[PDB]
Amino acid sequence: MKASRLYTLVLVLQPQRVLLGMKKRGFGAGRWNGFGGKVQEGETIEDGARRELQEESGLTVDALHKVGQIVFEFVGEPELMDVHVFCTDSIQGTPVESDEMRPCWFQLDQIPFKDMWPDASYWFPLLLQKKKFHGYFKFQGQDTILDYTLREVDTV
Ligand code: NA
């Protein structure tokens, strides 16, 4: 069995639009995603998610709601990514570009799936329907899913 590392992912989902961030530099640049990163020692997962949202988007929020969990496995990487997915309760400031991520609003009939992680085509529709989910995705590289599971759950 494999060890897992904790990550967060935050979707700022409003009634007609969603905020995504384009990764600007390094490997993986060019893909839109929610905001997030590794959880740090001592902080709750929710507090790590709030911290990453502020660092990557500039938005400071008091509370998030957990909507899902996705485990990622990559061929050749023994460590799994255990990603805890949150949506914002409300926001009260403007997003800002950080040298590493460019935030952008998308209308909910223009979700940029072709420029997102392939897994998001599966779980983001559940997120839009205000459902909770558990997913697992095994990737060859960045683009190819070899195996995956997705289930709606009542409790994350
Ligand atoms: Na990040």
Author numbering: 1 to 156
Direct quotes from the study:
In the nucleotide pool, which is more susceptible to oxidation by reactive oxygen species than DNA, human MutT homolog 1 (hMTH1, human NUDT1) is the most prominent mammalian enzyme among other enzymes responsible for sanitization of the nucleotide pool. hMTH1 is characterized by broad substrate specificity as compared with Escherichia coli MutT; that is, hMTH1 hydrolyzes different oxidized nucleotides such as 8-oxo-dGTP, 2-oxo-dATP, and 8-oxo-dATP with almost the same efficiency, whereas MutT shows high substrate specificity for 8-oxoguanine nucleotides. Accordingly, hMTH1 prevents mutations and cell dysfunction by its hydrolytic activity toward both 2-oxo-dATP and 8-oxo-dGTP. Here, we carried out structural and kinetic analyses of hMTH1 and demonstrated that hMTH1 shows broad substrate specificity for 8-oxo-dGTP and 2-oxo-dATP because of the exchange of the protonation state at Asp-119 and Asp-120 depending on the substrate.
To validate the correlations between the structure and kinetics in the Asp-120 mutants, crystal structures of the Asp-120 mutants (D120N and D120A) in complex with 8-oxo-dGTP or 2-oxo-dATP were determined, respectively. On the other hand, in the structure of D120A complexed with 2-oxo-dATP, there is no electron density of 2-oxo-dATP, but there are electron densities of water molecules in the substrate-binding site. Our kinetic analysis showed that D120A has 6-fold higher Km compared with the wild type, and crystals of the D120A·2-oxo-dATP complex were prepared using a higher concentration of 2-oxo-dATP (see “Materials and Methods”). The substitution of Asp-120 with Ala decreases the affinity for 2-oxo-dATP 6-fold, but the D120N mutant retains the 2-oxo-dATPase activity similar to that of the wild type, with comparable Km and kcat, indicating that Asp-120 is protonated during the recognition of 2-oxo-dATP. The loss of the direct interaction between 2-oxoA and Asp-120 explains the lower affinity of D120A for 2-oxo-dATP.
